[PDB]
Design a binder for this molecule. Structure first.
Ligand SMILES: N#Cc1ccn2c(-c3ccncc3)c(-c3ccc(F)cc3)nc2c1
Ligand SMILES: [Cl-]
Length: 306
């Protein structure tokens, strides 16, 4: 019996994540494709249970796939949500590992809106990376809308009934991708809303420069590696990262880096700050992205790009 979840047939294997087993599926009642995620029950890291509850909490919001099923088939935990298109990292490589100024802007306002809606539901993401932001699929109304997925690192920062922020703390091991995590994350501080925004800043400069100065650093093990990445993050100001770039990015990273621990960040001020970038360059925020031009204008291909 290959079909799982009563109504979801296993299709292609696309599994990535942190070796988390991800599969293509389709709903045999209506043929709609889905993204099936596997997980061993008797494992050393149970997480798929709470990720199922996370999508339900953010259900109905734009950019969050709908949770359809969580079951106990065989010796695997199974979560069915919406299948989506490639990640921003996938399109990044295909666009020559560099994004134009127009694309990174319109992308940044969508990511900031997604992260705002996450914090609106009393959750922080803590796993900001372009591998977790996906576009829709071809032909759909949200084909180029940027979506957010993978909430296995989502932690509550305020209670839903007294809206009080958790207390500040320290001594937390450095878990995640060190290339984009905030400076406070390297220092072992308890993450909050401001750390999901500094990591967004790192991704913006990452898309702009094609790389980051704290990339490819050599160290014996990973602690010193994670440390050695933190030094360069604090050595280089935000202006030197904005070299030859619209200075509004330097302002964005500097602002979100001086935010206090429990403060609500001015989401719409940052998005408008990034909107004004298109004013100084004479461009219209119409939607046109870099990846709408590969392969003679067809879009993105599978056997040539990936
Ligand atoms: N790096 C990387 C990466 C890229 C894509 N995904 C997906 C995904 C999401 C929607 N459609 C297709 C694939 C998932 C995922 C998460 C939960 C779930 F229940 C099903 C799939 N996890 C990852 C990791
Ligand atoms: Cl790296």
């Amino acid at each position: 019996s290959s079909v799982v979840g009563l109504h979801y047939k296993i299709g292609k294997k696309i599994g990535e994540g942190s070796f988390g087993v991800i599969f293509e599926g389709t709903n045999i009642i209506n043929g709609v494709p889905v993204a099936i995620k596997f997980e061993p029950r008797k494992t050393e890291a149970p997480q798929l249970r709470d990720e199922y509850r996370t999508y339900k909490h953010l259900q109905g919001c734009d950019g969050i796939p709908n949770a359809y099923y969580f079951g106990q088939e065989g010796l695997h935990n199974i979560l069915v949500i919406d299948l989506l298109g490639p990640s921003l990292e996938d399109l990044f490589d295909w666009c020559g590992r560099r994004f134009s100024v127009k694309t990174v802007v319109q992308v940044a306002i969508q990511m900031l809106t997604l992260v705002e809606e996450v914090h609106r539901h009393d959750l922080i993401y803590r796993d900001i990376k372009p591998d977790n932001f996906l576009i829709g699929r071809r032909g759909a109304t949200d084909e180029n809308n940027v979506h957010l997925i993978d909430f296995g690192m989502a932690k509550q920062y305020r209670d839903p009934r007294t809206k009080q922020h958790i207390p500040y703390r320290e001594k937390k091991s450095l878990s995640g991708t060190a290339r984009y995590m905030s400076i406070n994350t390297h220092l072992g501080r308890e993450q909050s809303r401001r750390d999901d925004l500094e990591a967004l800043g790192h991704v913006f400069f990452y898309f702009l420069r094609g790389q980051l100065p704290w990339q490819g650093l050599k160290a014996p093990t990973n602690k010193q590696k994670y440390e050695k990445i933190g030094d360069k993050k604090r050595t280089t100001p935000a202006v030197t990262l904005c070299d030859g770039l619209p200075q509004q990015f330097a302002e964005y990273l500097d602002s979100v880096r001086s935010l206090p621990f429990d403060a609500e960040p001015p989401y719409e001020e940052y998005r408008m700050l990034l909107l004004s970038v298109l004013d100084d360059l004479g461009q219209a925020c119409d939607g046109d992205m870099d990846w709408m031009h590969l392969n003679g204008g067809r879009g993105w291909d599978a056997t040539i790009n990936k």
